[PDB]
């Protein structure tokens, strides 16, 4: 997470929860409850069990790694590099 | 809907497809900007290059 961190994680992100509303290239994550110019199908209301809260990057589809909506006009939404589990 | 999560997993597999068709749209819409660069030489080929 910061310069010196060497945090372990599951695996595919899954089921990480992390204070995490930044990308890898400087974009800044877009609220789940809130709605920005970029439309979004993923409503908390359907999925409270999917700990949907603020604007962090979370893993809510079960997909390959965590993704998040980005509040760029030329980037809807990007996906998430997290640290993998290799023990 | 708005307080009940019933039949979530169906409205979440949609969504799925949703973003599937989004997310592959985006690349046309980039394509649009310059058709050069999306049908004749590299950066197709290069941009898309592997994913699954």
Sequence with gaps: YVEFSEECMHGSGENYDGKISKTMSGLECQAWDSQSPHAHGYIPSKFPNKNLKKNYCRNPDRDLRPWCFTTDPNKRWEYCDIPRCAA | ?52
Aim: charged share 50%; glycine share 2%.
């Design chain 2, 1 to 52: 809907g708005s307080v009940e999560k019933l039949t979530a997993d169906a409205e979440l597999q949609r969504l799925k497809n949703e973003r599937h068709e989004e997310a592959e749209l985006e690349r046309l819409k980039s394509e649009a900007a310059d058709h050069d660069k999306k049908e004749a030489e590299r950066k197709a080929l290069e941009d898309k290059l592997a994913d699954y």
